[PDB]
């Protein structure tokens, strides 16, 4: 009752303490800025620095433990609901391991070969129908061998473990679970070493969701972005190829040549120096150069590299500002088309904000009533609530449609004043 009670509690009290883990991370960063070099902690008039320090550090690790417990309570069943639904319908409509046998991509999928052996399989799609239905439909024509291919403190080693082992392997495929679990391990490494303990703060990247839109505006185009910057680095690489092979003695970090002249006849550290300055030069690759004494090579190197710093300033900047501001514009595009199509076409409607303003305030009511988005959902509840005997022939009819998943009960969106008017 302790365990199940706290399961129900971390169910009902989860995002509050998620915001508290946020706030405790803030309290970490407020104080993790008073170090002094053997390393120790400075003292000011709040005479509880080190005690409450250690307390709230291990306590924030405890909060991470709390949120991973509450997350195991959280949408993990919806995860496996999606998963078991997916697998059971790709047995139902498909029968993938029967005959179809998918490829080596998504052993997320092929992982689920042996869970069909586990007779406890379609728990979290409530659909124990699917096993014997596939056995009847698909299994009979391909045989009883295929039926055998798919059929075949105290309580610790006496249950369907491989079902649960499979389940945990599915659990490890998650991204948000891996995210929060890696966050938890950061909290653990703070108990081992409370100096990378303050490195938790990448969780605010999935924290307040505007910041997540910022990071998405980074990352949704970020394939092109990162591959582009790699291409840019190759451009600078090849530039430093070009910016060596005549220009081999000139540019030196040295004290005029008394200290040994720092021009790089290594190719590699020439790249390193060049690249370094390019990404931290400011003026370009001309800052560290000799005075234009006026060799025929020297007109070449001056005009050469001032134009090539210029071309850096062209290419890498144009990458940065074009890619990012157009990413922001794309982020605009998404939500503006959202707010367009919400104000025009309900999903069950899909006609427009046109007929239902010829009915004045008929679009208001049309939205609220005619397609009333969650009420068709509530009817799906009502089907799941009622029984097919208890159903109407209309209810069982559309239920039979739902057995087909053929959707034709849903109209073109032409409503009751579209049939007559």
């Amino acid at each position: 009752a302790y365990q199940q009670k706290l399961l129900n509690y971390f169910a009902r009290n989860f995002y509050n303490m998620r915001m508290l883990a946020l706030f405790v991370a803030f309290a970490i960063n407020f104080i993790l800025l008073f170090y002094k070099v053997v390393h120790y902690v400075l003292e000011e008039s709040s005479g509880y620095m080190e005690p409450t320090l250690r307390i709230l550090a291990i306590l924030h690790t405890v909060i991470s433990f709390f949120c991973i417990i509450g997350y195991y309570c959280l949408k993990v069943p919806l995860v496996i609901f999606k998963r078991e639904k997916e697998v059971a319908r790709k047995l139902e409509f498909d029968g993938l391991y029967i005959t179809e046998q998918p490829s080596e991509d998504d052993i997320k999928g092929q992982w689920d070969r042996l869970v069909i052996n586990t007779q406890s399989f379609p728990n979290n799609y409530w659909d124990k129908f699917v096993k014997r239905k596939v056995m009847d439909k698909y299994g009979e024509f391909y045989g009883r061998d295929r039926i055998s291919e798919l059929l075949g403190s105290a309580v610790l080693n006496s249950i369907d473990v491989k079902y649960q082992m499979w389940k945990l392997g599915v659990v490890f495929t998650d991204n948000s679970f891996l995210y929060l679990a890696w966050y938890m391990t950061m909290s653990v490494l703070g108990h081992y070493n409370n100096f990378f303990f303050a490195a938790h703060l990448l969780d605010i990247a999935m924290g307040f969701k505007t910041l997540r839109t910022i990071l998405s505006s980074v990352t949704h185009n970020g394939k092109q972005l990162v591959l582009t910057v790699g291409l840019l680095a190759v451009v600078v690489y090849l530039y430093t190829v070009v910016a060596f092979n005549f220009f081999r003695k000139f540019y030196n970090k040295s004290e005029d040549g008394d200290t040994p002249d720092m021009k790089c006849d290594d190719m590699l550290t020439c790249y390193m120096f060049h690249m370094y300055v390019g990404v931290r030069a400011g003026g370009g690759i001309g800052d560290e150069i000799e005075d234009p004494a006026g060799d025929e090579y020297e007109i070449y190197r001056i005009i050469f590299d001032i134009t090539f710093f210029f071309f850096v300033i062209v290419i890498l900047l144009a990458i940065i500002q074009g890619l990012i501001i157009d990413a922001f514009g794309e982020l605009r595009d998404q939500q503006e088309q959202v707010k367009e199509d919400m104000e025009t076409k309900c999903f069950i409607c899909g006609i427009g904000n046109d007929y239902f303003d010829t009915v004045p305030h008929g679009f208001e009511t049309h939205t609220l009533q005619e397609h009333n988005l969650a009420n068709y959902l509530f009817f799906l509840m009502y089907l799941i609530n009622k029984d097919e005997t208890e159903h109407t022939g209309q209810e069982s009819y559309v239920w039979k449609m739902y057995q087909e998943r053929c959707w034709e009960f849903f109209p073109a969106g032409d409503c009751f004043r579209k049939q007559y008017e």
Partner: protein, 155 residues
């Protein structure tokens, strides 16, 4: 109840003599109505759906409108509580179907993570999607949503 003023006093006393008149004269709220009134609530709900689809089928009937509006507090009560949907279920006109919404299921819907994942799903569909897998994946989202409300109900 007279401080509530909502009943005719004849019917207040009809409810009083109806209630218990017991143990001094005292009375319970639940045990007098609930076990019968909530079924009768479902009954008059069905009546409300009945007259509603009488109007919706057959409009513009001041006889029916009068008969409707005399019954009106029921209609106002069950106005969230009614289920109402439209389809074309092989009768090949445009076919509305009215039913029951468990309001407890809307308290389940009252969960805002449902709302946020819902608006997210709105964004998903308007973002992209085939128009024929549209309502398919919509219903799939609804199924996940139903199971989610089962989860939120058992807490």
């Amino acid at each position: 109840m007279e401080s509530h003023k909502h009943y005719t006093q004849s019917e207040t006393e009809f409810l009083l003599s109806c209630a218990e008149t017991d143990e001094n004269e005292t009375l319970d709220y639940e045990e007098f109505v609930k076990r019968f009134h909530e079924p009768a609530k479902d009954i008059g709900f069905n009546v409300a759906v009945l007259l509603t689809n009488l109007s919706e089928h057959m409009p513009n009937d001041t006889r029916l409108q009068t008969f409707l509006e005399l019954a009106e507090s029921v209609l106002n009560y069950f106005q969230p509580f009614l289920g109402r949907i439209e389809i074309m279920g092989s009768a090949k006109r445009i076919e509305r179907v009215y039913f029951e919404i468990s309001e407890s299921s809307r308290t389940q819907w009252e969960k805002p993570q449902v709302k946020e994942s819902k608006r997210q799903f709105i964004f998903d569909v308007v973002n992209e999607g085939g128009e024929k897998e549209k309502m398919e994946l919509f219903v799939n989202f609804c199924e996940d949503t139903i199971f989610e409300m089962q989860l939120a109900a058992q807490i």
